[PDB]
Amino acid sequence: RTLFSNLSDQDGGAIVAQLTQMNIPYRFANGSGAIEVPADKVHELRLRLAQ
Amino acid sequence: RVHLAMPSPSASVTVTLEPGRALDEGQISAVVHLVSSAVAG
């Protein structure tokens, strides 16, 4: 889901680290490596990003 | 990161809080009055 458009790779990697921490799969995007998660987890993922 | 102004004296502290927390208004006074009273005058 396009929660954010064209995130940088450092942000993607950091969210990957936090996702390894939590459990939610730390996926990538179309040739950009931007995390992608199930529909429900995007809320709590953006909450984690805010934290 | 604490910095002093020793010659009126002054101090500047750059604190990076732990992600997922935020000190209250009476909680910043902690470091403020600590670095202020750790410095003469």
UniProtKB/Swiss-Prot annotation, chain B:
Name where it's found.
Answer: Cell inner membrane; Bacterial flagellum basal body
Signal sequence annotation: none
The UniProt induction remark is: Inhibited in nutrient-poor medium.
- Family affiliation: Belongs to the FliF family.
What is the protein's known function? The M ring may be actively involved in energy transduction.
Describe its assembly: The basal body constitutes a major portion of the flagellar organelle and consists of four rings (L,P,S, and M) mounted on a central rod. The M ring is integral to the inner membrane of the cell and may be connected to the flagellar rod via the S ring. The S (supramembrane ring) lies just distal to the M ring. The L and P rings lie in the outer membrane and the periplasmic space, respectively.
This chain's protein is named Flagellar M-ring protein
Q: Which gene encodes it?
A: fliF
Quote the range of the complete protein represented.
Answer: 154 to 204 of 560
